[PDB]
């Protein structure tokens, strides 16, 4: 079995095991700050630095993999609490879109809302460009902003939220389990065939964004994740 | 919503919050052991006291649930390392089966196999009776120990596992990610459909057992639980 | 060349192997609880029964030695978790200090903290009494409590931690790797002369205790040993 | 703290985790063949892909680390058993020396045996020009083949081998324990200060090489790291 597996529970700045795209900042308590509140149409991008190889071309395998993380989302005075966070997998070359005007695109498509990407958005601002739900919301996005499909939920300024994800290879079904302030758990699932949707080798990682008045924090704390493939 | 979560992180004797059947015992160490090593056909099996809805006959929704475990099977001299363990859901009137054989019945089923029930097993041996795969598996079990589909996997005496389930509503898939001591994770996923399978009211717990050559160490080290019930 | 080595990953009560001093237990999983939860200052260690010949008179040859165990500490209810677990080597006729008072002493020095052996202490207490540092901490003790050298570390209840020790006689160098459940690794390393500070024949072992108002769980798990002493 | 860890129970060719340099073939059993039997003075090292952060500039701490690994070494008919196996860390950009004569540089070192690496041979032959003992042995190579320190060995052909390191940045001391077929442990140590020797990222791996007369079978069967660095 070919196995990749790592975990952070603080980040650091200087770190090889992590790239840093775009408006990203390592803040002293560890914690990792995505977007810039002084900077318009702000996007930030973390990625984890080695590319994971989720199938074979050879065998014709796929990987299963294992990961949660948590993050924490707060308002900032006169800004409307905005756009959100996403949680990506996207081909090794992946870089910002060029010219991203940031906002409802999360720092992952362009202004039509595509891209070449698989995610989970945890979306706080309804763009209905994108035919976005009235109200926050969790889903699943296939090489687009516009959600395959989404669940309704609330983001808690200020609070810690924490996530589980799990793909199993076989079904090929990606479930999501968040654990919101209260207690309370969301989940939502849905199959998605990485091997058809992705090459072989690929990263993973977390995006942010803002607009011209739409800014708040976007805070990732700490990651783990574990992916085995295989090979035989 | 209608939430209940409990966390174990250590179990007791006297603990109202929890059920013992058959030849559970609860070490110094805070584990509990499953079965007893001396007798033939042991059978022991801990379940949460407080029967948890799961659905409701009046909205027609059914519950989501995250839960977590960790577990550790060894071996003892002389005797086969069997039979295994086994997470089960089942209704509230839950106990024992009359007569249990223990051995590949995991302490649910009848001699055929057959009972009411849902459950994800660590099988570590080859019943052809139940069509048991020639190797160590993880198995989502209907009603059955004739697992509805299987996923080869390795049990590691003195190994401390842990497994990670979510259940999505929606969707009504179970997915389970089993984290080997090794750091290699094993993954399997299925649709059951709960609300026409149990009843409104069930009971969540372990169950283990042996025979009279084949018996081991089955432990329980922890237990954390989270459903959540959309009553609207 | 002279070498003793063993392995055991389960322990059993009546193996002529291993010698019992004090409130030792032997669990039915094969674990060994080293202190009596119900008893005031409670003592207990293990000792490998035969006695290894660490140095030659004939020669002036001292033995290199390479071994790695694993523990486990969980907090009980209404008592402090103290005092912790001390892997030690001692003279062949080594007991439990008379009158111990269990606490700080870890069960092998007196009320000063003297006492005649060489240990890697896993002190889970801050006894100002013997200069104990403000943290949980792992440190290098030769003939006292009173280490000659500490590291900063942090017990986690419930935890299974892993440690390699290694001695190499030419330099007299003593350097310990502890792998925290989290992954993380802790390491310290010394200069201590075994054939300066004890005699011969030696015994290897470990030891816990507790007092009044402090008690926990201390658990070993597993412990294989390999010294080689060149007999020319 | 800032953590790197990985384990290779058998590898694979494809996986973007290693870098392949040189005569490195990796056979179907999983195992990594790092010369090649048909070419004259051949030269294979294999490298961990992701480069570790040994040390800061900010900070000024250096990391430590716990690293075991097993390999293996058979004769081939007619050429002698040469020239062996080296564990070396050296800077990110590290590439087999321009115009390698193999042999006695073991695929690290130009023609006088200097370099820019640390690492731990396993040397199968005696290159007087490199001041080598006349007996096959471990050595501590600090910037060249010509041993820091050296201990007797003895390499039996065919016989799996197992090593365990430990490097305390405190100290500054890297510790070997090297365990041969038939139980005796073999051990060596010394004071090597990364920080002054090696630049903040390195890259860890194995090298191993031929001559035209010299040449075996180097293998590389299993490896896990672990690295932690204090970043505070
Ligand atoms: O208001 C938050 C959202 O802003 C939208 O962009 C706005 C911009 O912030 C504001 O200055 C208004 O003038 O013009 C734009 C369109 O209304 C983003 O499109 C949306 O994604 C949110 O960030
Ligand atoms: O509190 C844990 C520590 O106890 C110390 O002994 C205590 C005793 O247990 C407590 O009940 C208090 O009454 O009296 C003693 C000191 O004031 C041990 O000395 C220390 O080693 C821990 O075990
Ligand atoms: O005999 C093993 C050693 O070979 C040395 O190279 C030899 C070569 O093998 C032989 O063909 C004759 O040509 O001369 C060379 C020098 O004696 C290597 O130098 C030595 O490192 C071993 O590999
Ligand atoms: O061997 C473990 C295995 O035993 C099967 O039952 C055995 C029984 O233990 C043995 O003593 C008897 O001689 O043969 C039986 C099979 O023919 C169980 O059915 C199986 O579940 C395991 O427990
Ligand atoms: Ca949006
Ligand atoms: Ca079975
Ligand atoms: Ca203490
Ligand atoms: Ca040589
Ligand atoms: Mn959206
Ligand atoms: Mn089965
Ligand atoms: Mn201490
Ligand atoms: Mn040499």
Request: no cysteine.
């Given at each position: 079995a070919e196995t990749v597996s790592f975990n952070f529970n603080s980040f650091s700045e200087g770190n090889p095991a992590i790239n840093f795209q775009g408006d990203v900042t390592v803040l002293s308590n560890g914690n990792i700050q995505l977007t810039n509140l002084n900077k318009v149409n702000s996007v930030g991008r973390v990625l984890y630095a080695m590319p994971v190889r989720i199938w074979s071309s050879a065998t014709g395998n796929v990987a299963s993999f294992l990961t949660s993380f948590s993050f924490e989302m707060k308002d900032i005075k006169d800004y409307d609490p905005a756009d959100g966070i996403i949680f990506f997998i996207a081909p090794?070359?992946?870089?910002?879109?060029?010219?991203?005007?940031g906002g409802g695109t999360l720092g992952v498509s362009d202004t039509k809302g595509a891209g070449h990407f698989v995610g989970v958005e945890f979306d706080t601002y309804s763009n209905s460009e994108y035919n976005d739900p009235p109200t926050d919301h969790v889903g699943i996005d296939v090489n687009s902003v516009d959600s395959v499909k989404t669940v309704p939920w609330n983001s808690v300024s200020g609070a810690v939220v924490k996530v589980t994800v799990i793909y199993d290879s076989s079904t090929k079904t990606l479930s999501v389990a968040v654990t919101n302030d209260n207690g309370d758990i969301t989940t939502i699932a849905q199959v998605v065939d990485l091997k058809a949707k992705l090459p072989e080798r690929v990263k993973f990682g977390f995006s942010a964004s803002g607009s011209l008045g739409g800014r708040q924090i976007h805070l990732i704390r700490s990651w783990s994740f574990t992916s085995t493939l295989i090979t035989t």
């Open positions: 090794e070359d992946t870089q910002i879109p060029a010219g991203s005007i």
